[PDB]
Design a protein around this ligand. Structure first.
Ligand SMILES: Nc1ncnc2c1ncn2[C@@H]1O[C@H](COP(=O)(O)OP(=O)(O)O)[C@@H](O)[C@H]1O
Length: 324
């Protein structure tokens, strides 16, 4: 190439008129911002390209029940709180469980939680609550539970059936500018492909029409396998694919563990992530760390870092220092 002449000038024009990262090649290591929100999984973190979800942008997390969406949502939230941040939770499902949130790192006490009466409301609240500039993150549990005021009151609206896609489009449009000027990232939980499921692949094509286009990031969270511990069902392994990422190349895979009541294993995430990058060395079942050993079985290894917090932070570091 010299072909690379006009092309690079072009792409400059694309990012010029249409948003920022409108065009890029799968193989890049983009700018890397200073403000991000770690997901709780370094694995996912790196797949997002920027070690956290983007700020001031809308984010769609979708997949089947019992996948890992809320957990992820709740972790992503526990952190906006560590850096002194205010988080809001718009609840249309009435299925949030504090004892679990808290167990993950979420200050439930200071966690704002609305319980909308119509979807048209839920969004109004979520908006004029955003136009504040006080919230760092806001989670909308269930995109489908936001029923229009007309379908819920039996009848009292316009342009009949197929309206809640309008309420979304018309609202998402307002939150866009609202979020792009306040630095509030929002997570929309979308309940219900994931490659490796099979049997068909559902019915009538939307990852939320509007949401599909508004979303800057879109996670495809699917449960890939339920875990064990020679005892029972400790948790399960989750697979997240980033089908959309306007902050860095998309289509990146991220896999991690989630344990009932515990959440995402940072430790277990560090091992499988530190070895693949030569930081950790498996041999004879010993996940030894440069000279000194960690544990016999990966579980016992998960536990080691769990006890040796100091050495675990040193691994998380080296890895994020090797890439981003
Ligand atoms: N109250 C809870 N107690 C124990 N584990 C829980 C609890 N809530 C969620 N989980 C864990 O999260 C997984 C499902 O994720 P979320 O609960 O993220 O569902 P979605 O995946 O959002 O339906 C479950 O398999 C379980 O391991």
């Amino acid at each position: 190439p010299d072909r690379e002449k006009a092309l690079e000038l072009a792409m400059a024009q694309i990012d010029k008129n249409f948003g920022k990262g409108s065009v890029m090649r799968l193989g890049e290591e983009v700018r890397q911002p200073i403000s991000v929100i770690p997901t709780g999984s370094i694995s996912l973190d790196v797949a997002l390209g920027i070690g956290g979800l983007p700020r001031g942008r809308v984010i769609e997390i979708y997949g089947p029940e019992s996948s890992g969406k809320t957990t992820v949502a709740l972790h992503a939230v526990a952190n906006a709180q560590a850096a002194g941040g205010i988080a809001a939770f718009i609840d249309a499902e009435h299925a949030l469980d504090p004892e679990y949130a808290k167990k993950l790192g979420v200050d439930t006490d200071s966690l704002l939680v609305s319980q909308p009466d119509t979807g048209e409301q839920a969004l109004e609240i979520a908006d004029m609550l955003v136009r504040s500039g006080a919230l760092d993150i806001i989670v909308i549990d269930s995109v489908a539970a936001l029923v229009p005021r007309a379908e819920i009151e039996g009848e009292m609206g316009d342009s009949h059936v197929g309206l809640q896609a309008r309420l979304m489009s018309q609202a998402l449009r307002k939150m866009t500018g609202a979020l792009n000027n306040s630095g509030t990232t929002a997570i929309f939980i979308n309940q219900l492909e994931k490659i490796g499921v099979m049997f068909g692949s559902p019915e009538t094509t939307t990852g939320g029409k509007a949401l599909k286009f508004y979303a800057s990031v879109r996670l495809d969270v699917r449960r890939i396998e339920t875990l064990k511990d020679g005892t029972d069902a400790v948790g399960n392994r989750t697979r997240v694919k980033v089908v959309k990422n306007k902050v860095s190349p998309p289509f990146k895979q991220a896999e991690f563990d989630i344990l009932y009541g515990q959440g995402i294993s940072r430790e277990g995430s560090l091992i499988d992530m530190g070895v693949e990058h030569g930081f950790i060395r498996k041999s004879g079942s010993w996940f030894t760390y440069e000279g000194e050993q960690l544990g016999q079985g990966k579980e016992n290894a998960r536990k080691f870092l769990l006890e040796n917090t100091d050495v675990a932070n040193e691994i998380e570091k080296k890895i994020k220092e090797k890439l981003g």
